[PDB]
Curated annotation (Swiss-Prot):
Species lineage: Eukaryota, Metazoa, Chordata, Craniata, Vertebrata
InterPro entries: Actin (IPR004000), Actin/actin-like_CS (IPR020902), Actin_CS (IPR004001), ATPase_NBD (IPR043129)
Interaction with alpha-actinin: region residues: 99-112, 347-359
Organism: Oryctolagus cuniculus
Keywords assigned by UniProt, alphabetized: Acetylation, ADP-ribosylation, ATP-binding, Cytoplasm, Cytoskeleton, Hydrolase, Methylation, Muscle protein, Nucleotide-binding, Oxidation
Modified residues (ADP-ribosylarginine): 166
Modified residues (Tele-methylhistidine): 62
Protein name: Actin, alpha skeletal muscle
E.C. code: 3.6.4.-
Similarity comment: family membership: Belongs to the actin family.
SMART domains named among the record's database cross-references: ACTIN
GO MF entry, a single one: ATP binding
Key word Acetylation present: yes
Domain of life of the source: Eukaryota
GO cellular component: actin filament; actin filament bundle; cell body; cytoplasm; filamentous actin; filopodium; lamellipodium; skeletal muscle myofibril
Length: 363
């Protein structure tokens, strides 16, 4: 009687039942296999734990299920042992990436059915659900996850294909920068195990600089904005610079040898690429979702950043909910449990007559 909502991210899967206030599961989005030709698998955590004897791969690169057979594993694990449920008797909601390919979708679809024999299923735009979980039916989202960040302006519930912005800069690239400028402040973080740390150092300490400059040399001639962080065991390396400098990369891709424009930029471009009737609103309903959109004051930074690039008579709104980190899943949750939605599901039958193409016709 309960359907499922699996939000496939590049870094983390989020899964759960249609109706819970939060994803019952949220595990590493990796898959470990032995070493070679001769227990051929291990998803999420099992894989990390037993890493020492398997080589780990992420099956989703920048929002895209690129490693397929590995994914099937992942799904099987999510169901049968992350939810401990029978796919055959549970309708399934799958998150999807903006501009995700017809194929990459028809595949996903195919799978659920042919492989898992789910009863009915559906694929939804991440930013969209995410948006729906904030009230708005129309607006423009900023989804900066782990492997990518997008920009989606949506109209009365419809993402504006033409006007979408894909920025391959996200959490990891971001951690990587951190664990770079941290080996250069006199350390050595290079192995992946240091990453997960420099990463936790990230999630935790570092933040959003309002005025990059006055907040650069603000603590550049002071310790007042410094902090301590105990190493994996004992040490207390201090942070100062690396803090707002890490995220800052989101507003300044240069820092990574990235030619692309920063957030507020792409956000603007996007409104601007949207027929004028709506922008007024777009400016007004600017939603933030995604782990990396979790830094502090990034909220404000954007307020500023934007207004600066927009009509000095635009009512500009920033909406950065606390639940961001799972925004999507929830949206999926709600949308999934909706009566009327019950007609949106794509039953096997439907799928049996017409093919996997049946999915594209949405909402
Ligand atoms: N407070 C925080 N500040 C900065 N980054 C954070 C914070 N909390 C979590 N993150 C980062 O957000 C990322 C996880 O975000 P999220 O779950 O939205 O990504 P995903 O959905 O798995 O991947 P995708 O990019 O495909 O959407 C990690 O890179 C993590 O370090
Ligand atoms: C608490 C946690 C949060 C998170 O966001 O995890 C995601 C998923 C994680 C999986 C790979 C690692 C080795 C194995 C197990 C991890 C378990 C929990 C990780 O790889 C990330 O860390 C990468 C690496 S560094 C970064 O910025 N993204 C993001
Ligand atoms: Mg995601």
């Amino acid at each position: 009687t309960t359907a499922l909502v699996c939000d496939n991210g590049s870094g983390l899967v989020k899964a759960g039942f249609a109706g819970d206030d939060a994803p019952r599961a949220v595990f590493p989005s990796i898959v470990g296999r032995p070493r070679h030709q001769g227990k051929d698998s291990y998803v999420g955590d099992e894989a990390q734990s037993k890493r020492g004897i398997l080589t780990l791969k992420y099956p989703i690169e920048h929002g895209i299920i690129t490693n397929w057979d590995d994914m099937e594993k992942i799904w099987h694990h999510t169901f049968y042992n992350e939810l401990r449920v029978a796919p055959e008797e549970h309708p399934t909601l799958l998150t999807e990436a903006p501009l995700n390919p017809k194929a990459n979708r028809e595949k996903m679809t195919q799978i659920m059915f042919e492989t898992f024999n789910v009863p009915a299923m559906y694929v939804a735009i991440q930013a969209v659900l995410s948006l729906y979980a904030s009230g708005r039916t129309t607006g423009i989202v900023l989804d900066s996850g782990d492997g990518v960040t997008h920009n989606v302006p949506i109209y009365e519930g419809y993402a504006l294909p033409h006007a979408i912005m894909r920025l391959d800069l996200a959490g990891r690239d971001l951690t990587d920068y951190l664990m770079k400028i941290l080996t250069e402040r006199g350390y050595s973080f290079v192995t992946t195990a240091e990453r997960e740390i420099v990463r936790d150092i990230k999630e935790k300490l570092c933040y959003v600089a309002l005025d990059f400059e006055n907040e650069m040399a603000t603590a550049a001639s002071s310790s007042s904005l410094e902090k301590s962080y105990e190493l994996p065991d004992g040490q207390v390396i201090t942070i100062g610079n690396e803090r707002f400098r890490c995220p800052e990369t989101l507003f300044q891709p240069s820092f990574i040898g990235m030619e692309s424009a920063g957030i507020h930029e792409t956000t603007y471009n996007s409104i601007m690429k949207c027929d004028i009737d709506i922008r007024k609103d777009l400016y007004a309903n600017n939603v933030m979702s995604g782990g990396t959109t979790m830094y502090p004051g990034i909220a404000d930074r954007m307020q500023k950043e934007i207004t600066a690039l927009a009509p000095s008579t635009m009512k500009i709104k920033i909406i950065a909910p606390p639940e961001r980190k799972y925004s999507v899943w929830i949206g999926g949750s709600i949308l999934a449990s909706l009566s009327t939605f019950q007609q949106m599901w794509i039953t096997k039958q439907e799928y049996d007559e017409a093919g996997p193409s049946i999915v594209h016709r949405k909402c």
